[PDB]
Amino acid sequence: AGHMEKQQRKTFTAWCNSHLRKAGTQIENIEEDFRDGLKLMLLLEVISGERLAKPKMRVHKISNVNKALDFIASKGVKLIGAEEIVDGNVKMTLGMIWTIILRFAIQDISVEETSAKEGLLLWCQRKTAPYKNVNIQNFHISWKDGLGFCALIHRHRPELIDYGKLRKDDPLTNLNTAFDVAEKYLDIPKMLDAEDIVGTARPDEKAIMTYVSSFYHAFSGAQEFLEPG
């Protein structure tokens, strides 16, 4: 339970499905749908463009999950436990998906010889720097009023948002505007809940990084496989 888990369940699920839809499927319950490892394997194949080992019981689920872990390991990722994944351990399942997001969607981001998390932050800063009422300094409260998200969109597609009519003191509108526009026009699923952001002063960094990284991939064209489906 908890605020962190709630945000991660929403964001991670939406991110996974932005890619799984390319493979003709999707998960519908992150606490249950990776337990048999099939969808975990399919997700890895979609975002890497590589072919994993060929995929109904206990060790059958363990085997598929292990096939997924083997692939992750061959890509340099640390490594939770296969048993805990098969058993539906929420914390560990979310942690595993985060390691996948970090490795396959953020780690390889680079701007002005800066990479991974710092690279993504700098890209955000470069894109939003022109806007006087935005000041991205982190992956949490800097995005709370919603102008940052609106700025990322406006910098790439000025006709989608009338930036000058955005008022910092109406964050619900700023957030909903960016979220709806990104979903409709950019194919970036709503990974964040506007009302829930207004209700906190500590939005989850991993959830925010995940969502912003999708804007990077939607606009850069840097990594074909990471573009939203």
From Swiss-Prot:
Changing residue 77 to I: In BDPLT15; the mutation dominantly affects the actin filament assembly likely resulting in abnormal cytoskeletal organization. Residues 5-217 are annotated as: Actin-binding. Residues 6-105, 114-220 form the Calponin-homology (CH) domain. It is found in: Cytoplasm, Cytoskeleton; Cytoplasm, Myofibril, Sarcomere, Z line; Cell membrane; Cell junction. The modification N6-acetyllysine is found at residues 67, 165. It is linked to Bleeding disorder, platelet-type, 15: An autosomal dominant form of macrothrombocytopenia. Affected individuals usually have no or only mild bleeding tendency, such as epistaxis. Laboratory studies show decreased numbers of large platelets and anisocytosis, but the platelets show no in vitro functional abnormalities. Belongs to the alpha-actinin family. F-actin cross-linking protein which is thought to anchor actin to a variety of intracellular structures. Association with IGSF8 regulates the immune synapse formation and is required for efficient T-cell activation. This is Alpha-actinin-1. It comes from Homo sapiens (Human). The chain holds residues 30 to 253 of 892 of the full protein.
